[PDB]
């Protein structure tokens, strides 16, 4: 027997459903969402890391002129300085006084760390559903973990479970995201080949192992000091190193609805929003004909104690007259009151104690025991605490 | 938290405001205003109807006075001099 | 759970206040009709 | 010290505590999550 | 100097643009699209193949009863047949006449072929476009391959090229696709754990090497023949084998806009539709001041031959009087006529022959040679072919 | 490149036909005005 039900996308709240197969005794199932996964479809634009300013030994031409060769390298910079007289350990390196030159060449490359220390620039398109949920089937708690697409079926205790498809459609991620180790940031990063010096994206590469790189660092060579062999330069500091200090809190801490952000793959776990359908194909092996059950007559409902709260703060005693010994289902016919007991045992002229939860001060509710209904009168009182540590219906 | 006592009377009624709220009370107040308007409209209609009754006998000649008391407060005071 | 749009209880008390409103509306409606009836009587009289 | 709401509007706030300090934080119906250093986040929920 | 231009998304058609930097002599660039692939992500749902009905030796219990054991196997079927009298080579296998039983057990597994012969069920999300543009820069054809997002910059011959972003987003693939070897089908396949017998998805597995499998084949055991040892059964034939015969033509043959479908990884190649912008940052080293050019005067235009077609079916001779020897740009000031020549050489009292393409029968067009304009009168004739094998403006 | 919306040629001939239409419209417009003018003359005469 296929049972279709819709529950809100709220983790930690137990929801009860009445399964009524015609000709068979009613069944009550308790369902609770333990966690809800939203995985977005990603497309890597580029990756950013620390840059390496590769500077070789300067070509000091004694008694002559050196010439710059235009090289096809990222951020390639070249300059020749006239009238240089450099000094070494044992004296002057050159013979001439003013007829010497120094060729200072430089270029920007990806640092050795880029394979380990890097930030990935992703473009989030669409996302999917998928999460797990528990359910008390036949007086035992069972764990069900499946994709919330409404296609992925999972069989637990000979019962087929179909979760989803998700009602919404909200995600904490934007159309452009940035991922560093275990932190995800909603960033409007610069496009590929449009990075600025000193900012996030000053060095852009396709993958941490990629060959060709983009570099905009504003590298300019300076004239060396008097009698000194060195390559002085003016360059904007690493944009990635600066961002790692001035990025702030990630989505894990800033996202609404209490979203938990996980990595590898990047997805949002536990997120309250919208509803979710759940189909349960209960086997006929767990059903019992009505005839095989008992009836009930003259019923009276007395409420000796009631406190309107999030938990079952109400106690109710129901008197009855049963035809025979058997199991009867207990369910509240009022949407404001919820019963803790799913099924109880009856015999003849006896009584039953049930725990109930309600929000109303004056509660007039109908309780369906087996196939017969009884009216309950209750005057519930306010609780001592205004704020509670657990969610309710 | 915020206790929502029952009453009473009224009193507690306003206490519930804190419990489930922003709103609630304002709508009730609007409803009360509408009820007052209905009450006021009825009274205005009643006064016009009272005129409709005193009509005819609005010309002249003896004839109430008379039924002018018993007489919906005008009636009289009205008959006289 | 819980959380929802009323109205709800608390019965009795609730009825006490509700009963106070709308009665005067009925009165002025009846009075209006009665005034119309008398007006028609005058119209007939003429 | 960092804190956020467990609802629609998280409103993240961060501050580096160095001296003896007393902090008063409002707890909404959805809940308030407070992280104090390297300790696991403390969850709080107001009672009716 | 940054030059922004918009060309239609049409492969095989050359487009000419006039680059006019104030104070510098005009430049003509001929661009032509080469290709425009399109790759879209895809999350493998499951894989389907031929199934294997694993049937062991039947347990024939002579003078006794055999009992079925409930086994956790895909499509596990068990049955015990009473009153069996089987025969072998040397006579009867059992002693008793009617007190014998036969246990017939069966289950469905993935065939050995599943590693080789299999169809993959993918879920297509978003697509990433990648191409190829030919540019006639400084009398030489250059190849530019970049992403059409309007961010990925490529430097060829010291000139920065920015392609895109795309005007439009159409793909021949739907949200659900099926891939078999080199053929892609737009199929609305059944979800994981919801396959029907005899249809595509009767056997569902995560990967061709996966351990756990889903099976719905409608397998029922039958009673064996008189004095025969065999396991007769009724089962719906392989859904994968049936689909391989009744699938029809793939996207490669049915897709619009003349799409070519490639595999490993799947993606659409060659597709027209919409326009595309192109930004070219031409170096200041490829520009020449105007003061370093010549002029012209008195110029007559004679058209000895014209045939209105997709290609340059028109010949035009322009007479002139030049001030000095230099290069002058040739461009049609009429949007209906296009000139093959970008630049020519002038001297003094001479002439020039140019090739032109037009659609109109009566063509009155202005040709701008250097900085002076000339009126051309042409009476073009229809071509021999009604259908051509190359696109035009 | 052709593939555009007209109109275009063929001059002369084209003008021959065009000139035939609209002239009568001008005539009836002028006549209308003249009739109004005469009407005003009558109005003045009265």
DSSP per position, chain F: -----------HHHHHHHTTSSHHHHHHHHHHHHHHHHHHHHHHH-
Please report where in the chains the tokens 């559903």 appear, as a residue. A129
Answer yes or no: are the C-beta atoms of A46 and A119 closer than 8 Å: no
A121 bridge partner residues: A46, A178
With CA atoms as reference, the chain D residue closest to A270 would be D6
Contacts of E338 in chain F (CB under 8 A): 1
Which token pair is A391?
């969610």
Contacts of F7 in chain E (CB under 8 A): none
A278 bridge partner residues: A5, A163
Answer yes or no: are the C-beta atoms of E75 and E236 closer than 8 Å: no
Resolution rounded to one decimal, in angstroms: 5.0
Contacts of A185 in chain D (CB under 8 A): none
Query: What single-letter DSSP state applies at residue E200?
Result: T
Compute the distance between CA of residue E359 and CA of residue E339 in angstroms, rounded to an integer.
Answer: 13
Compute the distance between CA of residue A293 and CA of residue A62 in angstroms, rounded to an integer.
Answer: 110
Please report where in the chains the tokens 């079925």 appear, as a residue. E68
Measured in degrees and rounded to the nearest 5, phi and psi for residue E309 equal: -145, 180
CA E48 distance to own-chain centroid: 24
Determine, for residues E43 and A43 on separate chains, whether the beta-carbon distance falls below 8 Å. no
Q: Number of A:B CB contacts under 8 A?
A: 11
Q: How many CB atoms lie within 10 A of CB A179?
A: 23
Answer yes or no: are the C-beta atoms of A3 and A279 closer than 8 Å: yes
Distance (Å) of CA A225 to CA A83, A233, E215? 12, 12, 80
In 3D space, the residue among E10, E15, E14 whose CA is nearest the CA of residue E35 turns out to be E10
**Bond prior to B70 in cis (omega within 30° of 0):** yes
Determine, for residues D46 and B1 on separate chains, whether the beta-carbon distance falls below 8 Å. yes
Nearest CB to A386: which of B2, B5, B20? B2
Compute the distance between CA of residue E51 and CA of residue E203 in angstroms, rounded to an integer.
Answer: 7
Nearest CB to C28: which of B31, B39, B50? B39
Contacts of B52 in chain C (CB under 8 A): 35, 38-39, 42
Answer yes or no: are the C-beta atoms of E258 and E270 closer than 8 Å: yes
Compute the distance between CA of residue E124 and CA of residue E262 in angstroms, rounded to an integer.
Answer: 15
3-state secondary structure of B35: helix
Measured in degrees and rounded to the nearest 5, phi and psi for residue E16 equal: -105, 135
Q: Could you report how far apart the first and last alpha carbons of chain E are, in Å?
A: 27
Measured in degrees and rounded to the nearest 5, phi and psi for residue A130 equal: 155, 125
Please report where in the chains the tokens 């047949």 appear, as a residue. E81
Report yes or no: A214 at the E interface, CB cutoff 8 Å.
Answer: yes
Report yes or no: D10 at the A interface, CB cutoff 8 Å.
Answer: yes
| B2/chain D closest Cα distance in angstroms | 6
Distance (Å) of CA A247 to CA A137, A179, A181, E154? 48, 12, 14, 29
Compute the distance between CA of residue E14 and CA of residue E6 in angstroms, rounded to an integer.
Answer: 13
Helical ranges in chain E per DSSP H: 239-243, 251-254
Determine, for residues B4 and A361 on separate chains, whether the beta-carbon distance falls below 8 Å. yes
Determine, for residues B6 and C42 on separate chains, whether the beta-carbon distance falls below 8 Å. no
Nearest CB to C10: which of A13, A336, A362? A362
Nearest CB to A361: which of C1, C2, C10? C10
Determine, for residues B4 and A386 on separate chains, whether the beta-carbon distance falls below 8 Å. no
Distance (Å) of CA A172 to CA A40, A267, D5, D22, E293? 10, 10, 15, 32, 61
Answer yes or no: are the C-beta atoms of A294 and A27 closer than 8 Å: no
With CA atoms as reference, the chain A residue closest to D12 would be A254
Answer yes or no: are the C-beta atoms of E193 and A159 closer than 8 Å: no
Contacts of B1 in chain D (CB under 8 A): 46-48
A255 burial (CB, 10 Å; 0-12 / 13-18 / 19+) is buried
Measured in degrees and rounded to the nearest 5, phi and psi for residue E132 equal: -175, 115
In 3D space, the residue among E249, E275, E247, E273 whose CA is nearest the CA of residue E261 turns out to be E249
Nearest CB to D12: which of A249, A382, A388? A249
Helical ranges in chain B per DSSP H: 12-15, 25-54
Answer yes or no: are the C-beta atoms of A185 and A177 closer than 8 Å: yes
E2 burial (CB, 10 Å; 0-12 / 13-18 / 19+) is exposed
E304 burial (CB, 10 Å; 0-12 / 13-18 / 19+) is exposed
Determine, for residues A385 and B1 on separate chains, whether the beta-carbon distance falls below 8 Å. yes
Rg of chain B, C-alpha, whole Å? 23
Q: Which residues of C24-36 are buried (b: 16+ CB within 10 A; e: fewer)?
A: bbebbeebbebbe
Compute the distance between CA of residue A181 and CA of residue A253 in angstroms, rounded to an integer.
Answer: 15
Determine which of A361, A362, A388 to mutate to test the interface with B (most B C-beta atoms within 10 Å).
A361
A191: Cβ contacts below 8 Å, ≥ 6 apart: A45, E149, E150, E151, E152
Compute the distance between CA of residue E326 and CA of residue E345 in angstroms, rounded to an integer.
Answer: 6
Determine, for residues B42 and C35 on separate chains, whether the beta-carbon distance falls below 8 Å. no
Answer yes or no: are the C-beta atoms of A141 and A135 closer than 8 Å: yes
* DSSP, residue by residue, E33-81: E---EEEEEE---EEE--EEEE----EEETTS--------STT-EEEEE
Distance (Å) of CA E379 to CA A298, E300, E332? 108, 16, 17
In 3D space, the residue among A19, A15, A44 whose CA is nearest the CA of residue A32 turns out to be A15
**Bond prior to B65 in cis (omega within 30° of 0):** yes
Answer yes or no: are the C-beta atoms of E338 and E357 closer than 8 Å: yes
Q: Which residues of E156-189 are buried (b: 16+ CB within 10 A; e: fewer)?
A: beebebbbbebeeeebbbeebbbbbeebbbbbeb
Answer yes or no: are the C-beta atoms of A14 and A135 closer than 8 Å: no
Compute the distance between CA of residue E382 and CA of residue E363 in angstroms, rounded to an integer.
Answer: 13
With CA atoms as reference, the chain A residue closest to E129 would be A43
Nearest CB to A386: which of D4, D31, D46? D46
Compute the distance between CA of residue E112 and CA of residue E50 in angstroms, rounded to an integer.
Answer: 9
Compute the distance between CA of residue A169 and CA of residue A273 in angstroms, rounded to an integer.
Answer: 8
Please report where in the chains the tokens 């399964």 appear, as a residue. A19
Measured in degrees and rounded to the nearest 5, phi and psi for residue B32 equal: -65, -40
Element holding E129 (H helix, E strand): strand E124-130
What are the CB-based long-range contacts (under 8 Å, 24+) for A149-155?
A149/E191, A150/A277, A150/A279, A150/E191, A151/E45, A151/E190, A151/E191, A151/E192, A151/E193, A151/E194, A152/E191, A152/E192, A152/E193, A153/E191, A153/E192, A153/E193, A153/E194, A154/E193, A155/E193
Which token pair is A241?
């190193």
**Bond prior to E347 in cis (omega within 30° of 0):** no
Distance (Å) of CA A148 to CA A166, A216, C12? 6, 45, 47
Compute the distance between CA of residue A167 and CA of residue A267 in angstroms, rounded to an integer.
Answer: 18
A134 bridge partner residues: A32, A143
A177 burial (CB, 10 Å; 0-12 / 13-18 / 19+) is buried
- Relative to beta strand A372-379, strand A362-369 is antiparallel
With CA atoms as reference, the chain F residue closest to E393 would be F1
Distance (Å) of CA A315 to CA A329, E119, E220? 18, 59, 53
Compute the distance between CA of residue E101 and CA of residue E106 in angstroms, rounded to an integer.
Answer: 17
CA A319 distance to own-chain centroid: 50
CA angle E62, E65, E66 (to 5 degrees): 100
Contacts of C4 in chain A (CB under 8 A): 336, 359
SS (H, E, C) chain A: CEEEEEEECCECCEEEEEECCCCECCEEEEEEEEECCEEECCCEEEEECCEEEECCCCEEECCCCCCCCCCCCCCCEEEEEECCCCEECCEECCCCCCCCEEEEEEEEEECHHHHCCCEEEECCCCEECCEEEEEECCCCEEEEEECCCCCCEEEECCEEEEECCCCCCCCCCCCCEEEECCEEECCCCCCCCCCCCCCCCCEEECCCCCCCEEECCCCEECCCCCCCCCCCEECCCCHHHHHCCCCCCCHHHHCCCCCEEECCCCEEECCCCCEEEEEEECCHHHCCECCCCCCCEEEEEEEEEEECCCCCCEEEEEEEECCCCEEEEEEECCCCCEECCCEEEECCEEEEEEEEECCCCEEEEEEEECCEEEEEEEECECCCCCECCCCCC
Residues of B within an 8 Å Cβ radius of C: 6-10, 13, 20, 24, 31-32, 35, 38-39, 41-46, 48-50, 52-53, 55-56
Answer yes or no: are the C-beta atoms of A58 and A360 closer than 8 Å: no
Compute the distance between CA of residue E393 and CA of residue E15 in angstroms, rounded to an integer.
Answer: 8
A103 bridge partner residues: A59, A80
HSE-up of residue E344 (Cα within 13 Å, Cβ side): 20
Contacts of B41 in chain C (CB under 8 A): 25, 28
3-state secondary structure of E272: coil
Q: How many CB atoms lie within 10 A of CB F12?
A: 7
Answer yes or no: are the C-beta atoms of A306 and A376 closer than 8 Å: no
Compute the distance between CA of residue E216 and CA of residue E192 in angstroms, rounded to an integer.
Answer: 12
Chains that touch D (3 or more CB pairs under 8 A): A, B
**Residue C16 falls in which region: left (phi positive, over 0), alpha (psi -120 to 50) or beta:** alpha
Measured in degrees and rounded to the nearest 5, phi and psi for residue C36 equal: -60, -45
Element holding C44 (H helix, E strand): helix C23-45
Determine, for residues A357 and C1 on separate chains, whether the beta-carbon distance falls below 8 Å. yes
Measured in degrees and rounded to the nearest 5, phi and psi for residue F37 equal: -60, -45
With CA atoms as reference, the chain E residue closest to A147 would be E192
Nearest CB to A387: which of D9, D14, D27? D27
Compute the distance between CA of residue A368 and CA of residue A331 in angstroms, rounded to an integer.
Answer: 5
- Relative to beta strand E213-215, strand A349-357 is unpaired
Q: Could you report how far apart the first and last alpha carbons of chain D are, in Å?
A: 27
**Bond prior to B81 in cis (omega within 30° of 0):** yes
Which token pair is A105?
């060449």
Report yes or no: A191 at the E interface, CB cutoff 8 Å.
Answer: yes
Q: From the CB coordinates, do chains E and A have 3 or more pairs under 8 Å?
A: yes
E268 burial (CB, 10 Å; 0-12 / 13-18 / 19+) is buried
Nearest CB to A126: which of E126, E151, E190? E126
Compute the distance between CA of residue A199 and CA of residue A183 in angstroms, rounded to an integer.
Answer: 19
Answer yes or no: are the C-beta atoms of A120 and A183 closer than 8 Å: no
Which token pair is A307?
């406190």
**Bond prior to B75 in cis (omega within 30° of 0):** yes
In 3D space, the residue among C37, C26, C27 whose CA is nearest the CA of residue B53 turns out to be C37
| A306/chain E closest Cα distance in angstroms | 47
Answer yes or no: are the C-beta atoms of E296 and E370 closer than 8 Å: yes
Answer yes or no: are the C-beta atoms of B20 and C3 closer than 8 Å: yes
Compute the distance between CA of residue A75 and CA of residue A108 in angstroms, rounded to an integer.
Answer: 6
Compute the distance between CA of residue A57 and CA of residue A104 in angstroms, rounded to an integer.
Answer: 8
Rg of chain E, C-alpha, whole Å? 37
A159: Cβ contacts below 8 Å, ≥ 6 apart: A137, A280, A281, A282, A283, A286
Determine which of E338, E356, E359, E365 to mutate to test the interface with F (most F C-beta atoms within 10 Å).
E359
E242: Cβ contacts below 8 Å, ≥ 6 apart: E198, E199, E200
Element holding D14 (H helix, E strand): strand D13-14
Answer yes or no: are the C-beta atoms of A251 and A185 closer than 8 Å: yes
| B28/chain D closest Cα distance in angstroms | 24
Compute the distance between CA of residue E222 and CA of residue E227 in angstroms, rounded to an integer.
Answer: 15
Which token pair is A314?
């109400």
In 3D space, the residue among D45, D40, D42 whose CA is nearest the CA of residue D26 turns out to be D45
Which token pair is E149?
């997002």
Compute the distance between CA of residue A38 and CA of residue A11 in angstroms, rounded to an integer.
Answer: 14
With CA atoms as reference, the chain C residue closest to B57 would be C42
Q: Which residues of E131-140 are buried (b: 16+ CB within 10 A; e: fewer)?
A: bbbebbbeee
Compute the distance between CA of residue E231 and CA of residue E62 in angstroms, rounded to an integer.
Answer: 17
Answer yes or no: are the C-beta atoms of E321 and E297 closer than 8 Å: yes
Distance (Å) of CA A306 to CA A159, A310, A356, E302, F3? 37, 12, 9, 107, 84
Determine, for residues F1 and E308 on separate chains, whether the beta-carbon distance falls below 8 Å. no
CA E199 distance to own-chain centroid: 28
- Rounded to the nearest 10 degrees, how much is the dihedral formed by the CA atoms of B26, B29, B34, B40? -150
| B19/chain A closest Cα distance in angstroms | 9
Q: How many residues does chain A have?
A: 393
Compute the distance between CA of residue B23 and CA of residue C6 in angstroms, rounded to an integer.
Answer: 12
Determine, for residues A389 and D45 on separate chains, whether the beta-carbon distance falls below 8 Å. yes
Nearest CB to A151: which of E154, E162, E194? E194
3-state secondary structure of E240: helix
Nearest CB to A386: which of B1, B5, B6? B1
């Amino acid at each position: 027997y296929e049972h279709v039900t819709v529950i809100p996308n709220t983790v930690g709240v137990p929801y009860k459903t009445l399964v009524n197969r015609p000709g068979y005794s009613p069944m009550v199932l308790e369902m609770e969402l333990l966690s809800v996964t939203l995985e977005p479809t990603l497309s890597l634009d580029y990756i950013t890391c620390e840059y390496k300013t590769v500077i070789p030994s300067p070509y000091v031409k004694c008694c002559g002129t050196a010439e710059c060769k235009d090289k096809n390298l990222p951020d390639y910079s070249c300059k020749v300085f006239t009238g240089v007289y450099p000094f070494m350990w044992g004296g002057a390196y050159c013979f001439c006084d003013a007829e010497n030159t120094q060729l200072s060449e430089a270029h920007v490359e990806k640092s050795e760390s880029c394979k380990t220390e890097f930030a990935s620039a992703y473009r989030a398109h669409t996302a999917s559903a998928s999460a797990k949920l528990r359910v008390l089937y036949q007086g035992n708690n069972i764990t069900v973990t499946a994709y919330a697409n409404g296609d992925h079926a999972v069989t637990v205790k000979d019962a087929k479970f179909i979760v989803g498809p998700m009602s919404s459609a909200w995600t904490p991620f934007d159309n452009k995201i940035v991922v560093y180790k275990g932190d995800v940031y909603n960033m409007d990063y610069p496009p590929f080949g449009a990075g600025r010096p000193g900012q996030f994206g000053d060095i852009q590469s396709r993958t941490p192992e990629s060959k060709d790189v983009y570099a905009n660092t504003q590298l300019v060579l300076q004239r060396p000091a008097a009698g000194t062999v060195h390559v002085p330069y003016s360059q904007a500091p690493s944009g990635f190193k600066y961002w790692l200090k001035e990025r702030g809190a990630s989505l894990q801490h800033t996202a609404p609805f209490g979203c938990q952000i996980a990595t590898n793959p990047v997805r949002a776990v536990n997120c309250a929003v919208g509803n979710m359908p759940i189909s349960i194909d209960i086997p006929e092996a767990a059903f019992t004909r009505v005839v095989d059950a008992p009836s009930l007559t003259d019923m009276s409902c007395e409420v000796p104690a009631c406190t309107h709260s999030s938990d079952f703060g109400g106690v109710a005693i129901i008197k009855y007259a049963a035809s025979k010994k058997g199991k009867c289902a207990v369910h509240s016919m009022t949407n404001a009151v919820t019963i803790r007991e799913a099924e109880i045992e009856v015999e003849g002229n006896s009584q039953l104690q049930i725990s109930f939860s309600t929000a109303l001060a004056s509660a007039e509710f109908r309780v369906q025991v087996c196939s017969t209904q009884v009216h309950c009168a209750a005057e519930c009182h306010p609780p001592k605490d205004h704020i509670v540590n657990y969610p309710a219906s | 938290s915020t206790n929502g006592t029952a009453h009473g009377h009224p009193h507690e009624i306003i206490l519930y405001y804190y419990e489930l709220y922003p709103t609630m009370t304002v709508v009730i107040v609007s409803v009360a205003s509408f009820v007052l308007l209905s009450m006021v409209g009825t009274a205005v209609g009643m006064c016009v109807c009272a005129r409709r009754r005193c009509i005819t006998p609005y010309e002249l000649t003896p004839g109430a006075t008379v039924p002018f008391l018993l007489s919906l407060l005008c009636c009289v005071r009205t008959t006289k001099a | 759970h819980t959380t929802l749009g009323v109205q709800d209880i608390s019965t009795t008390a609730m009825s006490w206040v509700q009963k106070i409103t709308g009665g005067v509306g009925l009165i002025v409606a009846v009075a209006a009709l009665i005034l119309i009836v008398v007006l028609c009587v005058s119209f007939s009289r003429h | 010290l960092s804190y956020r709401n467990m609802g629609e509007e998280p409103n993240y706030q961060e501050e580096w505590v160095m001296h003896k300090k007393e902090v008063v934080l409002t707890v909404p119906t959805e809940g308030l999550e407070v992280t104090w250093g390297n300790n696991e986040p403390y969850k709080y929920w107001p009672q009716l």
